[PDB]
């Protein structure tokens with residue numbers, strides 16, 4: 098088929114394109130405006146290989162300015178990953194690009210998909226929509242975001258449901274849980290903490306470090322994401338959690354990084370940042386059932402992979 | 412005490428201001444940018460009756476072009492009604508004004524209220540957030556909007572929760588159910604059908620006319636809205652349905668209108684329009700407990716009042 102990947106030069110999008118291109122029967126169109134928290138230099142690195150592949154077409158344009166008629170011509174599947182993704186930087190004057198790139202972009206894509214015959218529109222969303230929840234969260238749980246970011250991503254999900262129900266756009270929603278590994282964005286905790294540790298600079302901890310995440314290794318995330326395309330079973334209209342092998346606190350992670358480096362971290366404990374939950378924890382039963390999803394990369398292996406990537410990057 | 416009412420020149424806002432001005436204790440500031448579906452001619456008359464009262468101050472400005480710090484210094488309570496409200500006109504290129512005036516306006520007001528000492532931030536929302544549900548809907552039900560309009564309004568609610576949890580802004584959310592009576596917007600069903608019936612023209616019905624609403628008479632809406640200010644109970648953080656005395660389908664309303672006009676209407680059944688639920692039905696248990704809310708205006712009395720107003724307007 099022809100598969101459109103929005104946000105193709107980003108962390109997850111770059112990996113997803115590479116995975117799809119291993120199947121000789123797939124042709125990939127990647128669109129990326131090179132905005133958000135990752136510098137354009139890192140994004141060029143993410144796609145340099147991809148651009149050599151003859152079955153990849155790269156478009157460096159804003160989805161809000163591009164000819165969406167041309168873009169979606171003969172597209173069989175859309176993977177919509179384009180977004181402004183930072184939890185902590187979505188307040189005051191920094192909110193507008195979240196609304197433009199998370200809400201207006203999703204709506205304009207969904208409008209463009211009304212007059213074409215997609216197999217699937219695979220919309221990427223976030224554990225950030227759940228907000229502050231206790232236990233493993235299931236996809237039927239009432240979402241109450243804690244960040245303006247989370248609000249804009251949940252508005253994107255609701256636009257998906259509006260366009261599915263009214264115009265039969267074949268939407269599938271994936272909710273990722275804190276994805277890490279090679280090419281992780283430089284605003285995320287593991288990139289920052291590894292870069293700090295490499296430079297013998299203080300590790301920046303927001304609050305006391307006891308907060309936990311369901312960290313998902315990139316290869317696990319991509320296996321789940323590709324499974325959503327490749328299943329022959331009806332998952333249209335479904336919201337599916339994609340979570341990781343092993344939860345950990347930021348203190349637990351730092352201890353694991355010290356074992357990889359053989360260094361001892363200097364720690365700087367900052368104020369908690371408004372808008373962050375203290376815990377995330379996916380119930381991935383539905384992904385297990387629908388996609389045969391099971392994450393297999395341990396934090397020790399995934400963290401070594403990221404540490405190696407960050408060291409070579411800088 | 413001093414009360415800011417956004418969207419003060421609008422249908423519900425103008426009636427709200429009118430009700431608050433009856434209390435000589437209350438100083439009222441109205442702000443309205445004269446946008447949305449109602450032509451500015453009808454809104455002028457709204458602010459003209461309000462401006463007879465010395466305790467009313469009117470600001471004719473976009474909330475996005477206002478010094479909100481300056482405005483809010485002496486404000487005790489905000490009623491936030493300003494929005495783009497039409498369910499049916501929120502598709503395609505019409506969507507952006509809903510994002511601007513429903514999402515960016517709400518965010519920017521909440522940002523300005525972060526360091527104000529408010530008693531209450533009373534955010535007006537809509538039954539449109541629920542989408543299609545069976546039975547009387549309670550406020551803890553998972554909302555799945557059917558329209559882009561509904562998505563933008565539920566995004567505003569989510570912003571209220573974010574700013575409440577992170578910054579202790581004392582938000583209360585009211586979900587209104589299809590409000591009618593004198594001053595009803597010309598794009599709403601009762602206004603169009605009464606105008607049509609008055610001029611012996613076909614009554615335009617969008618589908619089979621079996622659609623029903625929990626229609627709320629304006630005076631009932633306003634009594635519940637004023638109760639949110641005056642209640643003895645703690646309602647900070649609550650979502651509260653404000654629904655009407657009697658549910659009806661459009662066919663029923665057309666029969667009730669024939670009784671009032673003494674006319675037999677010609678019907679013009681048109682294609683159902685995307686993004687509209689078939690039923691709305693409020694569980695008003697919570698309003699009854701927290702606000703002593705009981706709607707008291709019957710459809711026959713309310714339609715008569717709206718009939719007399721439409722007759723007078725044209």
Ligand SMILES: NC(=O)c1ccc[n+]([C@@H]2O[C@H](COP(=O)([O-])OP(=O)(O)OC[C@H]3O[C@@H](n4cnc5c(N)ncnc54)[C@H](O)[C@@H]3O)[C@@H](O)[C@H]2O)c1
Pocket residue numbers: 103104105106107108109110128129130131132133134135140158159160161177178179180181182198202221222223224250272273274275276277282
């Ligand atoms: N990284 C995670 O932990 C994680 C977890 C949950 C969900 N998500 C979601 O996964 C997706 C990918 O996240 P990521 O970490 O790869 O982020 P990223 O910033 O690395 O990638 C997103 C890409 O979208 C592009 N983009 C944004 N707006 C655009 C526009 N208007 N037109 C064209 N391109 C545009 C950016 O240039 C960027 O390269 C996002 O939707 C994010 O919300 C990520």
Ligand SMILES: NC(=O)c1ccc[n+]([C@@H]2O[C@H](COP(=O)([O-])OP(=O)(O)OC[C@H]3O[C@@H](n4cnc5c(N)ncnc54)[C@H](O)[C@@H]3O)[C@@H](O)[C@H]2O)c1
Pocket residue numbers: 417418419420421422423424442443444445446447448449454472473474475491492493494495496512516535536537538564586587588589590591596
């Ligand atoms: N009418 C109903 O049946 C109903 C039911 C549910 C909820 N609501 C909600 O009630 C509120 C009032 O609805 P209404 O029927 O009175 O609508 P309306 O259009 O009569 O009034 C809203 C007013 O907001 C003003 N406004 C919009 N954007 C603005 C901005 N940026 N700055 C300043 N003013 C701005 C408009 O000029 C308009 O006069 C809305 O929030 C709507 O979503 C209405």
Ligand SMILES: O=C(O)[C@H]1O[C@H](OP(=O)(O)OP(=O)(O)OC[C@H]2O[C@@H](n3ccc(=O)[nH]c3=O)[C@H](O)[C@@H]2O)[C@H](O)[C@@H](O)[C@@H]1O
Pocket residue numbers: 182183184185222223224225226273274275276284285286287289290301302303304306308309310347373374377
């Ligand atoms: O799962 C998700 O939906 C979200 O996951 C991540 O968001 P976040 O959980 O903030 O991921 P990190 O940035 O890796 O933060 C993880 C934890 O580390 C903490 N942190 C972060 C950065 C840092 O320098 N120090 C620090 O202690 C944060 O407080 C947080 O508790 C992504 O950045 C989002 O794009 C995505 O939506």
Ligand SMILES: O=C(O)[C@H]1O[C@H](OP(=O)(O)OP(=O)(O)OC[C@H]2O[C@@H](n3ccc(=O)[nH]c3=O)[C@H](O)[C@@H]2O)[C@H](O)[C@@H](O)[C@@H]1O
Pocket residue numbers: 496497498499536537538539540587588589590598599600601603604615616617618622623624661687688691
């Ligand atoms: O309750 C709500 O939350 C919403 O109520 C109304 O929206 P709507 O329910 O569309 O109200 P009307 O415009 O009065 O429409 C009611 C019904 O009449 C129908 N209709 C409308 C107009 C018309 O000419 N003919 C007709 O049959 C519609 O299809 C709908 O089923 C308001 O317009 C919204 O601002 C508000 O958000």
